Design a binder for this molecule. Structure first.
Ligand SMILES: Nc1ncnc2c1ncn2[C@@H]1O[C@H](COP(=O)(O)OP(=O)(O)OP(=O)(O)O)[C@@H](O)[C@H]1O
Ligand SMILES: [Mg+2]
Length: 280
């Protein structure tokens, strides 16, 4: 096996790893690193090439292409450099200092984020998704863990990451998709319909629901009820939960959390919803 990307000797020459670990998955690890040349902070994603006994260099090359494709989009994280060693491919990504928006969806930080902030963040998530769909790219993994912030004091801008699930419209529903956290799967993924751009619009409704109410819209007593809630679209719009959420926001969420993907609006339409037309 031969190496394609820059040598690991170069990575150790130009960068220094730190003790800060940003994320650890099963086959990927994200460590913070500093450039020796300039001192700038970056995020290094280490991706194991062998997974479950299969060569996955091709999968990683796909993720790089997509990252490369949306380099002009500020709503998508920027790929700076790529290195490779024996077992890993290393992605030098732009550093998101604010962390995951999942932080804001918890009640601990509920009182520091207002509806005027959610409107802006959701308007930025749509701009990013609009770009991906303009290029026949579905993210298929827009859970709050994969949407980051450039800053949190004060609130910054969003940065979409994690393109290991990226496909192109019309692709089949392979096993990889139907394995993510059950509470974020769309209904069309559960009965094996071909994925579409509307699959992302579902997860955008969940993110907006989770930011305004600080609650998971579908999670249940066990994974089994979670599936029933999803396939029956059993969301809670009760007065006790939405007494402090505007009506325009409820209309926005209810237009996206529809069972029939054909009825969900496109990103282009969502960017025109009355709820997003505040004059900041
Ligand atoms: N550039 C970054 N800056 C800050 N944090 C990051 C950055 N990239 C990833 N993270 C954090 O690391 C965690 C895991 O990284 P990431 O989502 O990109 O890949 P993964 O889910 O572990 O694996 P795969 O891409 O194969 O699905 C994310 O939840 C995110 O919080
Ligand atoms: Mg992730």
């Amino acid at each position: 096996e031969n190496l394609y990307f820059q040598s690991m000797e170069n990575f150790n020459n130009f960068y220094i790893l730190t003790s800060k670990e940003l994320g650890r998955g099963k086959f990927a690890v994200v460590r913070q690193c500093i450039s020796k040349s300039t001192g700038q902070e970056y995020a290094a994603k280490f991706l194991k090439k062998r997974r479950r006994g299969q060569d996955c260099r091709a999968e990683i090359l796909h993720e790089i292409a997509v990252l490369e494709l949306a380099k002009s989009c500020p709503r998508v994280i920027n790929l700076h450099e790529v290195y490779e060693n024996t077992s890993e491919i290393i992605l030098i990504l732009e550093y998101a200092a604010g962390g995951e928006i999942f932080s804001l969806c918890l009640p601990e930080l509920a009182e520091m984020v207002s509806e005027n902030d959610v409107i802006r963040l959701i308007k930025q998530i749509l701009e990013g998704v609009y770009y991906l769909h303009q290029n026949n790219i579905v993210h298929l993994d827009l859970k709050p863990q994969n949407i980051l912030l450039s800053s949190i004091y004060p609130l910054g801008d969003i940065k979409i990451v994690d393109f290991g699930m990226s496909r192109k419209i019309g692709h089949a529903c392979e096993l990889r998709e139907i394995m993510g956290t059950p509470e974020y799967l769309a209904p069309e993924i559960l009965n094996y319909d071909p994925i579409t751009t509307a699959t992302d619009m579902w997860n955008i409704g969940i993110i907006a629901y989770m930011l305004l109410t600080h609650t998971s819209p579908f999670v249940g007593e066990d994974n089994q009820e979670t599936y029933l809630n999803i396939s029956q679209v059993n969301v809670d719009y009760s007065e006790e939960t939405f007494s402090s959420v505007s009506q325009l926001a409820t209309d926005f969420i209810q237009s996206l959390l529809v069972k029939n993907p054909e009825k969900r609006p496109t990103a282009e339409i969502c960017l025109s919803h009355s709820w997003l037309q505040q004059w900041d």
